[PDB]
Design an enzyme around this catalytic site. Structure first.
Site, short mmCIF file in Angstrom:
data_model
loop_
_atom_site.label_atom_id
_atom_site.label_comp_id
_atom_site.label_asym_id
_atom_site.label_seq_id
_atom_site.Cartn_x
_atom_site.Cartn_y
_atom_site.Cartn_z
N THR A 1 24.77 70.00 15.83
CA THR A 1 25.15 69.94 14.38
C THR A 1 25.15 68.67 13.55
O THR A 1 25.60 67.62 13.97
CB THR A 1 26.56 70.51 14.29
OG1 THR A 1 26.51 71.76 14.92
CG2 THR A 1 27.05 70.78 12.88
C1 LIG Z 1 25.24 71.00 16.85
C2 LIG Z 1 24.10 72.05 17.14
C3 LIG Z 1 25.58 70.26 18.14
O1 LIG Z 1 24.94 70.91 19.25
C4 LIG Z 1 26.60 71.72 16.33
O2 LIG Z 1 27.75 70.95 16.71
C5 LIG Z 1 26.88 73.19 16.70
C6 LIG Z 1 28.00 73.69 15.79
C7 LIG Z 1 28.06 75.10 15.64
C8 LIG Z 1 29.19 75.61 15.00
C9 LIG Z 1 29.36 76.98 14.78
C10 LIG Z 1 28.38 77.86 15.22
C11 LIG Z 1 27.24 77.37 15.86
C12 LIG Z 1 27.08 76.00 16.07
N1 LIG Z 1 27.38 73.31 18.07
C13 LIG Z 1 26.78 74.07 18.99
O3 LIG Z 1 25.75 74.71 18.81
C14 LIG Z 1 27.49 74.09 20.35
C15 LIG Z 1 27.31 72.77 21.04
C16 LIG Z 1 28.42 72.56 21.88
C17 LIG Z 1 28.51 73.21 23.11
C18 LIG Z 1 29.61 73.00 23.95
C19 LIG Z 1 30.63 72.14 23.56
O4 LIG Z 1 31.71 71.91 24.36
C20 LIG Z 1 32.54 73.06 24.60
C21 LIG Z 1 30.54 71.48 22.33
C22 LIG Z 1 29.45 71.70 21.50
N2 LIG Z 1 26.88 75.17 21.14
C23 LIG Z 1 27.56 76.26 21.51
O5 LIG Z 1 28.75 76.46 21.25
C24 LIG Z 1 26.74 77.27 22.30
C25 LIG Z 1 26.05 78.24 21.33
N3 LIG Z 1 27.61 78.01 23.23
C26 LIG Z 1 28.14 77.42 24.31
O6 LIG Z 1 27.96 76.25 24.63
C27 LIG Z 1 29.00 78.37 25.16
N4 LIG Z 1 29.25 77.74 26.44
C28 LIG Z 1 30.53 78.30 26.90
C29 LIG Z 1 30.82 78.19 28.34
O7 LIG Z 1 29.68 78.74 29.01
C30 LIG Z 1 28.51 77.92 28.78
C31 LIG Z 1 28.09 77.94 27.36
#
Ligand SMILES: *[C@@](C)(CO)[C@](*)(O)[C@H](Cc1ccccc1)NC(=O)[C@H](Cc1ccc(OC)cc1)NC(=O)[C@H](C)NC(=O)CN1CCOCC1
Ligand SMILES: *[C@@](C)(CO)[C@](*)(O)[C@H](Cc1ccccc1)NC(=O)[C@H](Cc1ccc(OC)cc1)NC(=O)[C@H](C)NC(=O)CN1CCOCC1
Ligand SMILES: *[C@@](C)(CO)[C@](*)(O)[C@H](Cc1ccccc1)NC(=O)[C@H](Cc1ccc(OC)cc1)NC(=O)[C@H](C)NC(=O)CN1CCOCC1
Ligand SMILES: [Mg+2]
Ligand SMILES: [Mg+2]
Ligand SMILES: [Mg+2]
Ligand SMILES: [Mg+2]
Ligand SMILES: [Mg+2]
Lengths: 211, 222, 233, 195, 204, 196, 226, 195, 233
Positions: free
Chosen positions: A1
């Protein structure tokens, strides 16, 4: 993000990207990182998507209940504080959330940064996420209080573009919002692929890139 | 030390049509380099014209499906047999997943059906409950193999109209159920070739206003 | 969280035209020590179900008691306990699967791999697996531990898919199971020659065979094998 | 947060606190006020782990304001500092301690004396003529040891404080974005808007 | 930390009817930061083409190394090296660093000048040769490329048709990889003419 | 492994099981663990199969070269060469070797070389994972100056029990008889020794 | 991998599958694991793919020079001795697990070889991730005094067991038969039970679908005359 | 050390390098020149681990000066950058690698063109219109992407560079004590003494 | 760096009026397993020195060979090898101490604790200790391992300081050593009943006693001991 938000003469601009990653894999090309809490309240999302969605949608429940009890809209200051207090219950448990609570209330336009640590900051301009440094560069050099609605929307849009280009974990599309005293106004989904080429030609920027 | 999680492999795929939706998944269940079953159903009819598949750790996947099916049952009891709309089911599932924020259901979940205007709908979930409505989504082991193919062949990404040379995009014409099933079968046939955890069989559940229909196709067993 | 102490190795099984077969050796290992040689790891529940268990023996004995108590409890205020409302293989399995998944969710598992083999009321064959993680799956052939690696390949040559089940007789199926048990004795270092075998048929009922032995073993070719390469004498 | 200083002069207490707030590699804010008024003649500045600082400060503020209303009376700076110390000493053996260091500047209206208390997150309280938390004292105490008198005016206290901030700005690797300065005296609390 | 995914990048090669194609993205980065959009990963030594993915310093180093070795080969042999022979040279050279390897994913593409037979090959970082009839993939979006190539590819494509297939395989794979993109190049190779085309793609 | 070597009136007999494991998988069920380093000097191997092979191969080379120069080496000499390799490379080896041989002057001799590389001359020796279970049996049943038939029975019964209790041991029981008469190989299958 | 070796009446046969993996991904669907050390000495490799190729080529090269030096046809025990001493020296870091077989003036031979340097003799052997599936078949059907046709059948059946039941094995079956007094016959793709079905659709694009920025001719020819 | 920037304009290359040197918690120097002249028309700035930076830079300087004397000829910026890259790529697999990142700014007198090369400690070389090492690019590249033209004058390049430094001074937590700026053009190397 | 595998336990010794006594049991332990029961750990060097070794047995056998080679080397070109230029206890000790300290300095020690007991040319008693670290010390009584904890206290009751040495006879000293060996057998879990004892006297020379046994043991009181507290039967 990359997300940003800033106050100005005619309210507050809110611009976010739409990329979502799972490591180096782009899991989503178009994810909504803004939440409509109420016609006069917005919330940005950065960090764990699940944490952002759950807690800000729970904030909306609590902001709605405030309206029913008091017959009046909650302030941005109070809404941001409710959210910060939620983060403080799950202190050290591993939540990852970085959000800006943007809105208009009786004090005028309001903007609060809130994160998983419980930090709650009032300010004119904020940018969160992996590409915030790129966005700040464009914002800091071009921001004014005297901005027109048209120019302000472009600034936030251009600032996200700067981040989407450089940051590998930012991109997809740009979602724009404009917050007024009559409520917030959506200003569309803008594909970065198309927007980049358009801005390059019209602005003359990104000279080093070939197209 | 005891590891409460495992990986049962498998791959799933949901595509939303104009007035239909499909949810497909391979029927192979595995641990490490062993095959547990060549036919272990992974996509389920949950009632109210909704289909669901929880891919990843099978024990958590089965538990979540079981709880959602149960949630549908109690939604009928508590709200005068009202039909659970796909958007309402999706939000309910978010809360099911976030109950275990600190001990997650280790699954990537997809549901499919029709929205309240009769159009096709697919919703996608991460293990901790972030969800979004989508047109096309592959989940599981071979998700990275399949999604780029769907970006190209469903949303016509990087495809332009001949003669214009990059100026005019390929127009986003809608796909029929017969056309979608072709892309699904080719997606899994290609995934089977290059991913060791994908194979044996392919089961597709198609959702229309008329109901839920099934189709099965053999895949390579190596 | 624990570690398994006294353990039981492979449990193997397969479907055939009229029912199911399940087998398991009579050994209770203590690491590399072959400590206990008279352990029954197939546990019948009524006259329509056999539960085969591998893994920790103390946890197996616990499960054995839960099943014995289940039968007692089902008979309470139940005039049809020996008829329409008798315990079905699907009931017994789902109970165990519920227990196994709950225990893993409390981070205190029953360190086992279980196969429930039986025949339902309507004559349908039942064969399903469940382990310490609460993971469940069904297949025409099922095996735990080493059996999964060595027995399944042999049993899948007889019943490779669902359509091969009606074509497979009880004589062929038993023959295949018994051959697999010999192969496991050749190659599994925590196995024994002595084993038990159970057949649950929809016509002839439950046949429980004890004190079986692996026979017709090939060892004679060993006399010709000398050294590890260049040695002739 | 980073730097919080304090100096007690003849007739007042002066607190100086940095303005910077940093998340990751980015400075989010350069105008942050790391202080809370506990009572009309008592001010508390704070520094420590993110989030904990403000919660603790606001929790203390609420308790002192509650006391003031109940008794229609302002607690002495000494009494407030002891209350704060106990809350921190209670906290340090908790499941998850509050990682906050504070300076309490107050004017005792009964004794007509300014008072400065330094309390760290363990509950270690000391009354001082001048104090600091973290690395701030390493750079500044040598100047204060040299230049400090107890009969200094408020203006002399501000000049000595400027010298301390200048030394910090020269030898600290971190940019703390200047300081907000506040004065606590018989007439109450006020902020020096130009520093 | 993982050397094979610090800089990012991808390479893909395909065979056609009396022709071969090799393509690459142009990105070079430092993890999340994009540094260069002109970092070409395809090199050629006579009529033999070599694409290299992975750690950029090793990509550069190996190019200079194979230039060195192929120039000497030519001086001594009095002829240009062929794809089959070069493939063995690449394998030999990588395995000689078995326990301190170059963190790369090379891909050879070319047409034998004598037989006219199209040839492609891929390697792992220590030299194992993957001689495929259809296509070879390499890079941080190798999983994505496998999915695209395996469905889009069909044998005996004509040069101008093969161009479209390999381009779409690369482009759409790159758009599902954070560490790949920022431009792309496609080489179309025939027995005595080679065309190089830069593709227009999204720059995020 | 279960291995042993036993001296008797006419010479010495080596004995061993035939099981080789990789964890719980039996990689070879008909292994020959009795290896020849000289005409009438053999050894039993336990521990790492790679290490014990590499050692025995080197020893065989040393004794072949010894023979070319100085004539037939003693059993003590062979045990010294094993020891020198096992001791000096103790940090990198995992080898438990029993050395047994027949001279006409010294008759039957047995030397055991455990992990550290120490040497111990004994009337009989046992080693390997399965030896632990037969320390009691072997101590109670061993006599000096047994007959060939008595010694074969003693080894057969001993290894039978070791195999019975040790999962790492199994298969056939191989034996090598070393006397003035020559070298005799013996084999005993499960159906024979299991019923003892 | 799955690889096997089977002895028979007048020789020995080895076989292998054709899958090579990089994680859960198949890198090569039709790879060649049957390696030639000398004309009548072949070996099949499992483990680190480059190690099985390199160690086989090195020893094969030295075996050829040895054969020339001694004016004799190479022996399997020589290849075995050279392989084990090389692998032992590298203490398992060269991850090559090989089944070595062949015919020579001494007769027919079959050995296995682990990465740490331990060798092993047998009438039937199996190595790799699918060795258990293959060994189950071999233990069920092997017998003394097999014919050539029976041994090839047993070997390929053993590989199939690996192909179908082991995820680390797949695609095709390669075979090499080494019979006494004959040339060794290498049967590449002896079985092909995993051909992909026709795709439902053709994904051939319209010419001009892809956007292009620049075009240029690449000079592959040398510097020209005149 | 910390921040090193570089920008190539129409007829020159401009390098900006921070002045701070920090040991422990104390800033030892605020006037440090993180650069070495390799040849009359080639300048190299550097940043990395303490000590290694200067040794490496001086070692390169010596080698290029040796070449210049031997051949009575100045190596092209491209040739020098390739020599430097090889030394670093050689270094990364050494027992103890040199942890140094460099920018090489040079004016090619043959081609009459300015050239900027960015090389990290791994030996990763790239020719760029503008470049940076470490975190410097995170803050500055967005401005450079927006404002940079290839036909810019040296004065326009300095103004754009000032904007980059101002942004760094606003959003970086660390105080790098300003920058020393140097220009490389056809007439050689000179330092901008007021910045 | 290594770990000791086959080990020898305590070595105990003391001075008396005319010489020194040294003793050590005949056991070679393999962890808790009492593997080898015929191990001699006292090694005479000439007719004036005895070296007692504890710790790793493979390293002991190595030292045993160094000493044997030392005697051979001293006799080379030495007409007075059996007289004035014979090996002295002080020479033998300093050699070993040099070796032990060099080996520890290369981080590859001889995992032993050594006591060199003997009588010098001038009739002076020699008794000194050295271990894997190259640490050396001398005392009227010396003991290794468990002996240091249990034997020294008993032996120091006889010879508490230097002035007690002339007052101590060989009969008293031997009696004390033999009692200590019994105490170690009672209380050391890695000890054996069988031991060797050596006396080096300035008048009667070297007396080497093998196949000694611990005798006069008290066990009878065990019959009265019942349970662990409240148990009466
Ligand atoms: C950019 C893309 C950084 O990657 C953004 O911060 C984005 C923000 C965002 C907000 C709302 C909806 C969509 C996206 N963040 C992500 O895409 C995020 C990155 C991230 C992952 C893990 C983190 O620590 C917990 C912090 C940031 N990605 C996700 O949330 C993805 C879609 N899902 C997961 O990571 C779910 N995990 C959960 C445990 O199992 C493994 C995957
Ligand atoms: C019994 C089975 C166990 O002690 C015997 O000692 C047996 C002796 C034997 C086997 C074959 C030929 C001659 C003699 N030893 C083994 O079967 C041995 C078990 C073992 C392995 C490693 C050890 O320490 C390093 C000690 C004992 N098996 C093997 O060596 C097999 C062939 N290989 C492996 O287990 C692979 N190992 C190699 C060492 O590193 C870990 C992987
Ligand atoms: C089956 C497929 C194992 O899954 C076989 O053993 C196969 C054997 C083989 C032999 C010759 C030619 C092709 C294939 N082995 C592989 O395919 C092998 C799998 C493997 C990966 C990692 C291992 O531990 C390091 C061991 C085996 N694949 C490879 O070697 C591939 C080509 N290379 C890599 O994955 C890169 N390796 C190089 C060695 O270092 C680790 C990463
Ligand atoms: Mg991007
Ligand atoms: Mg597959
Ligand atoms: Mg990308
Ligand atoms: Mg056994
Ligand atoms: Mg770089």
């Amino acid at each position: 993000t990359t997300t940003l938000a800033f106050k100005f003469q005619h309210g507050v601009i809110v611009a976010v990207d739409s990329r979502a990653t799972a490591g180096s894999y782009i899991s989503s090309l178009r994810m909504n990182k803004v939440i409509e809490i109420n016609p006069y309240l917005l919330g940005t999302m950065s960090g764990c998507a699940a944490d952002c969605q759950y807690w800000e949608r729970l904030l909306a429940k609590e902001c709605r209940l405030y309206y029913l009890r008091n017959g009046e809209r909650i302030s941005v200051s109070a809404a941001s504080k409710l959210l910060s207090n939620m983060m403080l219950q799950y202190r050290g448990m591993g939540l990852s959330m970085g959000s800006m609570i943007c809105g208009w209330d009786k004090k005028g336009p309001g903007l609060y940064y809130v994160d998983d640590n419980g930090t709650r900051l009032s300010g004119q301009m904020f940018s969160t996420g992996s590409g915030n440094t790129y966005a700040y560069g464009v914002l800091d050099s071009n921001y004014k209080w005297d901005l027109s609605v048209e120019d302000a929307l472009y600034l936030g849009k251009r600032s996200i573009l700067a981040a989407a280009h450089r940051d590998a974990y930012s991109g997809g599309s740009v979602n724009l919002y404009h917050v007024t005293e009559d409520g917030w106004i959506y200003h569309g989904n803008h594909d970065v692929g198309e927007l980049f080429w358009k801005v390059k030609e019209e602005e003359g920027s990104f000279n080093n890139v070939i197209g | 030390q005891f590891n409460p999680y495992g990986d049962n492999g498998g791959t799933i795929l949901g595509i939303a049509g104009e007035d239909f939706a499909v949810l497909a998944g391979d029927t192979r269940n595995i641990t490490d380099y062993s095959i547990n079953s060549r036919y272990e159903p992974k996509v389920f009819d949950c009632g109210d014209n909704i289909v669901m598949s929880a891919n990843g750790f099978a024990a958590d996947g089965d538990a979540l499906v079981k709880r959602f099916k149960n949630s549908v049952k109690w939604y009928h009891f508590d709200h005068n047999d009202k039909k659970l709309s796909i958007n309402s089911a999706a939000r309910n599932i978010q809360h099911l997943l976030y109950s275990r924020r600190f001990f997650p259901y280790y699954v990537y979940n997809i549901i499919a059906g029709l929205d309240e205007d009769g159009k096709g709908a697919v919703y996608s979930f991460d293990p901790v409950g972030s969800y979004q409505r989508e047109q096309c989504r592959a989940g599981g082991a071979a998700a990275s193999l399949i999604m780029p193919f769907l970006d190209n062949q469903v949303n016509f990404k990087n495809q332009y109209e001949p003669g214009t040379n990059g100026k005019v995009k390929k127009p986003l014409k809608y796909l029929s159920v017969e056309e979608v099933i072709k892309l699904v079968r080719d997606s899994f046939t290609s995934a089977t070739e290059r991913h060791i955890q994908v194979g044996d069989g392919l089961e597709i559940l198609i959702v229309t206003k008329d109901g839920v229909r099934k189709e099965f196709y053999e895949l390579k067993r190596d | 969280t624990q570690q398994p102490i006294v353990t039981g190795t492979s449990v193997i099984s397969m479907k055939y035209d009229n029912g199911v077969i399940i087998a398991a050796d009579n050994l209770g290992s203590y690491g590399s020590l072959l400590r206990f040689n008279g352990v029954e790891r197939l546990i019948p529940v009524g006259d329509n179900t056999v539960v085969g268990i591998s893994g920790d023996i103390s946890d197996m004995q616990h499960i054995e008691r839960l099943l014995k108590d289940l039968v007692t409890e089902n008979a309470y205020d139940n005039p049809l306990a020996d008829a329409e409302e008798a315990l079905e293989p699907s009931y017994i399995f789902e109970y165990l699967a519920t227990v196994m998944y709950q225990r893993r969710s409390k981070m205190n598992p029953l360190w086992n791999a279980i196969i429930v083999a039986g025949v339902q009321s309507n004559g349908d064959q039942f064969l399903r697996y469940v382990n310490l993680l609460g993971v469940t799956y069904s297949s025409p052939t099922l095996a735990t531990g080493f059996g999964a690696h060595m027995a399944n390949p042999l049993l899948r040559k007889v019943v490779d898919r669902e359509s091969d089940i009606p074509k497979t007789t009880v004589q062929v199926a038993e023959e295949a199971i018994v051959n697999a048990m010999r192969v496991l004795y050749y190659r599994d270092a925590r196995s024994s020659r002595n084993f038990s075998l159970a057949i649950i048929d929809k016509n002839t009922g439950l046949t429980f065979k004890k004190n079986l032995q692996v026979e017709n073993m090939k060892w004679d070719f060993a006399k010709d094998i000398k050294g590890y390469g260049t040695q002739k004498i | 947060m980073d730097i919080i200083l304090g100096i007690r002069v003849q007739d007042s207490v002066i607190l100086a606190s940095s303005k910077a707030v940093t998340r990751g590699i980015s400075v989010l804010k350069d105008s942050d006020d790391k202080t809370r008024q506990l009572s009309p003649h008592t001010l508390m500045s704070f520094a420590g782990e993110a989030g904990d600082t403000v919660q603790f400060a606001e929790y203390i503020q609420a308790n002192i304001q509650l006391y003031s209303i109940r008794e229609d009376y302002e607690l002495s700076p000494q009494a407030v500092s002891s209350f704060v110390r106990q809350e921190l000493a209670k906290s340090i053996r908790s499941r998850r301690p509050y990682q906050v260091n504070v300076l309490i500047g107050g004017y005792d209206k009964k004794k007509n004396k300014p008072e400065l208390y330094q309390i760290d997150y363990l509950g270690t309280k000391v009354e001082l003529p001048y104090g600091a938390h973290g690395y701030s004292g390493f750079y500044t105490f040598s100047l204060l040891d040299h230049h400090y008198r107890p009969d200094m005016t408020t203006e002399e206290g501000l000049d000595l404080l400027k010298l301390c901030v200048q030394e910090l700005e020269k030898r600290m690797p971190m940019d703390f974005k200047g300081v907000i300065v506040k004065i606590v005296d018989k007439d109450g609390i006020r902020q020096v808007d130009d520093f | 930390s993982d050397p094979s995914s610090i800089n990012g990048g991808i390479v893909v090669a395909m065979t056609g009817k009396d022709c071969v194609a090799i393509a690459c993205d142009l990105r070079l980065g430092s993890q999340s930061l994009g540094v260069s959009n002109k970092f070409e990963k395809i090199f050629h030594y006579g009529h033999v083409f070599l694409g290299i993915t992975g750690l950029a310093t090793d990509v550069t180093t190996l190019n200079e190394m194979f230039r060195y070795k192929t120039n000497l080969y030519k001086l001594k042999e009095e002829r240009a090296i062929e794809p089959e022979t070069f493939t063995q040279l690449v394998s030999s050279s990588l395995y000689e660093r078995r326990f301190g390897p170059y963190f790369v994913g090379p891909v050879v593409a070319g047409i034998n000048s004598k037989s006219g037979k199209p040839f492609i090959a891929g390697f792992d970082l220590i030299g194992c040769i993957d001689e495929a009839k259809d296509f070879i993939v390499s890079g941080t979006a190798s999983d994505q490329l496998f999915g695209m190539c395996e469905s889009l590819y069909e044998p005996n494509l004509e040069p101008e048709d093969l161009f479209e297939t390999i381009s779409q395989a690369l482009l759409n794979a790159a758009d599902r990889d954070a560490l790949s993109g920022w431009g792309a190049v496609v080489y179309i190779i025939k027995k005595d003419e080679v065309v190089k085309r830069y593709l227009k793609m999204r720059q995020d | 492994t279960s291995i042993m070597a036993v001296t008797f009136k006419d010479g010495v007999i080596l004995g061993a099981d035939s099981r080789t494991t990789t964890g719980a998988y039996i990689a070879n069920r008909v292994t020959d663990k009795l290896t020849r380093v000289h005409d009438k000097i053999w050894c039993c191997r336990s521990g790492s199969a790679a290490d014990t092979q590499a050692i025995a191969d080197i020893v065989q080379y040393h004794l072949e070269l010894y023979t070319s120069q100085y004539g037939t080496p003693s059993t003590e000499t062979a045990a010294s060469v094993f020891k020198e390799l096992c001791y000096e490379n103790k940090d990198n080896l995992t080898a438990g070797i029993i050395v047994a041989g027949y001279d006409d002057k010294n008759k039957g001799e047995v030397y055991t070389i455990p992990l550290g590389g120490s040497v111990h001359k004994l009337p009989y020796a046992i080693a390997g994972s399965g030896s632990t279970f037969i320390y009691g049996y072997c101590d109670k049943n061993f006599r000096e100056n047994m007959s060939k038939e008595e010694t074969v029975d003693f080894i057969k019964h001993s290894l039978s029990q070791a195999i019975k209790w040790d999962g790492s041991s199994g298969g056939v029981i191989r034996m090598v008889v070393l006397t003035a008469a020559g070298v005799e190989r013996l084999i005993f299958y499960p159906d024979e020794y299991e019923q003892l | 991998t799955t690889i096997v070796g089977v002895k028979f009446n007048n020789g020995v046969v080895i076989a292998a599958d054709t899958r090579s993996t990089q994680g859960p991904i198949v890198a090569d669907k039709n790879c060649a694991k049957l390696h030639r050390i000398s004309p009548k000495i072949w070996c099949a490799g499992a483990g680190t793919a480059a190690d099985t190729e390199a160690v086989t080529q090195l020893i094969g090269s030295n075996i050829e020079l040895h054969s020339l030096y001694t004016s004799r046809e190479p022996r399997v025990v020589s290849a075995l001795q050279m392989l084990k001493q090389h692998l032992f020296k590298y203490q398992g870091h060269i991850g090559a697990y090989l089944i070595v077989a062949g015919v020579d003036p001494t007769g027919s031979h079959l050995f296995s070889i682990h990465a740490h340097g331990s060798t092993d003799v047998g009438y039937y052997l199996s190595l790799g991730s699918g060795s258990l599936a293959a060994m189950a078949v071999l233990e069920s059907h092997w017998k003394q005094d097999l014919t050539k046709e029976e041994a090839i059948k047993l070997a390929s059946d053993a590989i199939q067991a690996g192909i179908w039941n082991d995820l680390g094995s797949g695609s095709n079956v390669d075979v090499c038969v080494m019979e006494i007094g004959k040339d060794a016959e290498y049967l590449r793709n002896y079985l092909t039970p995993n051909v992909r079905e026709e795709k439902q659709k053709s994904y051939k694009f319209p010419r001009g679908t892809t956007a292009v920025l620049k075009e240029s001719i690449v000079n592959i020819c040398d510097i020209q005359e005149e």
